[PDB]
Write a protein that binds this ligand. Structure first.
Ligand code: MG
Ligand code: MG
Ligand code: MG
Ligand code: MG
Ligand code: MG
Ligand code: MG
Ligand code: MG
Ligand code: MG
Ligand code: MG
Ligand code: MG
Ligand code: MG
Ligand code: MG
Ligand code: MG
Ligand code: MG
Ligand code: MG
Lengths: 127, 100, 152, 83, 114, 99
RNA sequence: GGUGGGCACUCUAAGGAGACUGCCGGUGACAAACCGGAGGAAGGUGGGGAUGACGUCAAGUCAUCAUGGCCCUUACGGCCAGGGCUACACACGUGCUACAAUGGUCGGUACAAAGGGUUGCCAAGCCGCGAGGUGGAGCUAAUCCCAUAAAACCGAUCGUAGUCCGGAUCGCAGUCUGCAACUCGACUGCGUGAAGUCGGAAUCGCUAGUAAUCGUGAAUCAGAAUGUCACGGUGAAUACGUU
């Protein structure tokens, strides 16, 4: 039984396990509301479930580590999508059009020598 | 990088290493929790009796090749613009140009 | 740019109204990356809108947006001695962006207690054509139609 | 300020000179360079010429200037005024 | 009532108007004599403003505080120490910059000539 | 029971040393718990290159330290010591534990 | 994960696979190439860095070092103690903190990356409002220590006031390093509480994980960072076009 997905987002990673169940959801062994408190993180972590309309049928066990709250939510979504793909591997198109299977490669640009930030410069008075 | 500068920093290092332990117990006596005021005073006067140019705080480490007070690196012993010369030739083991 | 290579991004995720336009409005009211604060401000303003009366707050929102997007815009151009100001129709995408920018900027400077109250007042007043934003729109329209000679 | 672990800080030679100067009462100033030394409560009423950087300035010590240092009574910069 | 104290405000913030009590001192005052800090002074029966008076009269207030501060400043001024000389001429005394940037002890810029 | 810790400034020769220790251990009949690559240590420097005032003209250098761990089970022949001149040859720091 | 244990997973670090206009449609001198599409983690030099051609400015450095010629050799060489490099009617450059209600205080709680430590890091316990003091465990370190991330979320209060905004300045009392904090250190407690209501002519940075904003670390270092160099968290607006 079960299915395993590995999601990754913004220096954060997530291990997700899908089993037969009734949508229990548990992240780091605590409830979804206790983890993502009143924001769109619930929406983003649930998106593939309702798009595939299998929110009620799967029991989910998640362990996430690294990054910030939004990055962790993105990791959960990515892992969930990959595990859902491997479960019933015929709806790759359905997620593909939604852009969930693609892994976002954006990362924090490094600081450069002589500059303040990665791109900001000092003021440049010419006189 | 006068030769006199290097000579007198060498003198300072020799003389600070000369005692190097009397200072230790004298500081221990001064900073001891329960040591009585008289012992505190005797330790203070004895420690102040020592030559002024004998404390580790007066040592300003310089380039061991040129004696440049500035741009010193303690991982190596070299200053700013001898380390680059040594590293370009490949003398320094492990040192390479990096990007990350 | 010269190369004409810019590609538009797709990040648009209204959480609990499912309305595409409110996400962009919250992006406009956001300052310094604090999505949650702007989120709260907009939702509080919409709660005030829905509790003043019977109107659907979202519907009042797009009614105000329609009643505030300009139709024509004035573009300056120096002709060799004087800078004239031609009129030109506004692209469909630029209308909503201009509308939101004006609405937020004018709600910034009203002077009630909280920013949510300022925004709510602006939506109520501009929903029939009485706000500062609507009269700015009228100023732009008259300025554009007073230069109809060039137009082309 | 110096910690209270060691109440005062006084130079050995200056302290010795001060303690000598009480057998016969205050008659002549004591010439010194040690600006770092704090005035003790029991050298009051005697005159000390402290170094300045060019000469020695004479300071007559009274009870109200006890907790300070000798260098606090010898300005090392002149600044007679821009105008 | 107070000594011309502000009213229609919480007791601790209202007390902080005494020139000799700050935030923490006012907290200590309200803690020593049982009174709710979150309570406006206009809602307090005099049975506790009296003990607020008794507690506040323990430290220092207004005239005597200024008296001793001016005593200390005058001592420094008359001694002739570096602190006193620096304080006579209206220049920073903790050892800050005077090449530029010391306008909190000089006011306006005072340009050369006129 | 004995554990080996290997340290070097580059990966080629540390890999060679791990391979030779492992193959000697396999030949001598003992068991080996697999080599463990411990995270490398990267220490960086940023040095000015002009002899005088050019602040934005810098140059960056780095030193990496690579660490490997071996350990053996059921030992009866002890010649890993006997290769004291050969298990470490040029630039490998080797630490032995539970000798 | 505390144990037996497991080699599944995350992770660490060596070797490989992968992306090549490869396949399809259209244009094109049926060429180079261009505009789209499918598949894919990634599509058109995927993102970033190192890499600086011949020469230019008699550009900078004789004070990092080296060196031709000139100059001093009872001083233009060497040793020492105090002072100065920290001055202050003014002018300019680069920053930091604010002028508040997308905010200030109090309470409750969640999630990082990177890095340094044996002349070192320096715990648990105890003593002080506090900086800190005693203590000595562990660690030559994916093991122990530095070490609590902050903004964000929830609750309560303040209600537009030069104020529960702002923090400069000054008075008193302390801690630490150091032979020694006067000139001239960094912090802590109590009190005081300035200018400041978004800034004239003018002018700067930035095209995506960027600007904006929030915190963390290291080098130098007895002590001394609003600077320098790195590291993550949240996360925008806009580009019709070359007049
Ligand atoms: Mg990075
Ligand atoms: Mg300028
Ligand atoms: Mg020489
Ligand atoms: Mg030093
Ligand atoms: Mg595709
Ligand atoms: Mg394509
Ligand atoms: Mg190339
Ligand atoms: Mg170059
Ligand atoms: Mg020249
Ligand atoms: Mg020149
Ligand atoms: Mg000297
Ligand atoms: Mg200077
Ligand atoms: Mg405040
Ligand atoms: Mg660009
Ligand atoms: Mg950053």
């Amino acid at each position: 039984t079960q299915n395993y997905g590995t999601g990754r987002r913004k220096t954060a990673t997530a291990r997700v396990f899908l089993r037969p169940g009734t949508g229990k959801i548990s992240i780091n062994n605590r409830g979804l509301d206790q983890f993502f408190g009143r924001e769109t993180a619930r929406m983003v972590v649930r998106q593939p479930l309702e798009l595939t309309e299998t929110v009620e049928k799967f029991d989910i066990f998640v362990t996430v580590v690294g990054g910030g709250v939004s990055g962790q939510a993105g990791a959960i979504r990515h892992g969930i999508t990959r595990a859902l793909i491997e479960y019933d591997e015929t709806l790759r198109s359905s997620l593909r059009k939604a852009g969930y299977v693609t892994r976002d490669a954006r990362e924090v640009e490094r600081k450069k020598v002589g500059l303040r930030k990665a791109r900001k410069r000092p003021q440049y008075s010419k006189r | 990088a006068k030769e006199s500068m290097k000579n007198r920093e060498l003198k300072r290092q020799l003389t600070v290493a000369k005692y190097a332990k009397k200072r230790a117990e004298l500081k221990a006596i001064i900073a001891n929790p329960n040591s009585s005021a008289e012992e505190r005073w005797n330790a203070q006067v004895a420690l102040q009796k020592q030559p002024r140019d004998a404390s580790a705080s007066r040592l300003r480490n310089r380039c061991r090749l040129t004696g440049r007070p500035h741009g010193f690196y303690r991982k190596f012993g070299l200053s700013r613009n001898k380390l680059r010369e040594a590293a370009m030739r490949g003398d320094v083991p492990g040192l390479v140009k990096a990007s990350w | 740019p010269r190369r004409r290579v810019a590609a538009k991004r797709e990040v648009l995720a209204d959480p609990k109204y499912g309305s595409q336009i409110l996400a962009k409005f919250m992006n406009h009211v956001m300052e310094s990356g604090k999505k949650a604060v702007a989120e709260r401000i907009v939702y509080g303003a919409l709660d005030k809108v829905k509790e003043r009366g019977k109107a659907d707050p979202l519907e009042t929102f797009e009614k105000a947006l329609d009643a505030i997007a300009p139709l024509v815009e004035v573009k300056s151009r120096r002709v060799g001695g004087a800078t004239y100001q031609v009129p030109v129709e506004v692209r469909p995408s630029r209308r909503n962006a201009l509308a939101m920018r004006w609405l937020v900027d004018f709600a910034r400077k009203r002077g009630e207690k909280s920013m949510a109250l300022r925004l709510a007042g602006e939506l109520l007043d501009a929903a029939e054509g009485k706000g500062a934003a609507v009269k700015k729109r009228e100023d732009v329209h008259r300025m554009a139609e007073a230069n109809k000679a060039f137009s082309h | 300020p110096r910690s209270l672990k060691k109440g005062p800080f006084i130079d050995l030679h200056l302290l010795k000179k001060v303690e000598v100067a009480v057998e016969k009462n205050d008659r002549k100033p004591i010439k010194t360079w040690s600006r770092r030394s704090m005035i003790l409560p029991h050298m009051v009423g005697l005159t000390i010429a402290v170094h300045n950087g060019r000469q020695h300035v004479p300071v007559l010590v009274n009870e109200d200037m006890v907790g300070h240092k000798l260098g606090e009574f010898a300005a090392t910069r002149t600044y007679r005024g821009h105008a | 009532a107070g000594v011309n104290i502000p009213d229609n405000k919480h007791t601790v913030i209202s007390l902080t108007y005494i020139y000799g009590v700050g935030r923490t001192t006012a907290q200590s005052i309200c803690a020593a004599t049982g009174v709710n800090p979150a309570a406006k002074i206009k809602d307090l029966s005099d049975e506790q403003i009296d003990q607020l008076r008794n507690e506040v009269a323990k430290i220092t207030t207004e005239g005597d505080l200024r008296r001793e501060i001016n005593m200390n400043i005058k001592r420094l001024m008359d001694l002739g120490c570096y602190r006193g000389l620096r304080h006579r001429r209206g220049l920073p005394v903790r050892g800050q910059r005077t090449k530029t940037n010391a306008r909190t002890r000089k006011g306006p810029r005072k340009p050369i000539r006129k | 029971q004995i554990r080996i810790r290997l340290k070097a400034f580059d990966h080629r020769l540390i890999d060679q040393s791990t391979q030779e220790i492992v193959e000697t251990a396999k030949r001598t009949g003992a068991q080996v718990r697999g080599p463990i690559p411990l995270p490398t240590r990267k220490e960086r420097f940023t040095v000015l290159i002009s002899p005088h005032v050019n602040k934005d003209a810098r140059d960056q250098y780095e030193i990496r330290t690579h660490k490997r761990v071996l350990d053996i089970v059921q030992p009866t022949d002890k010649t890993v010591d006997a290769l004291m001149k050969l298990d470490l040859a040029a630039g490998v720091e080797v630490q032995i534990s539970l000798g």
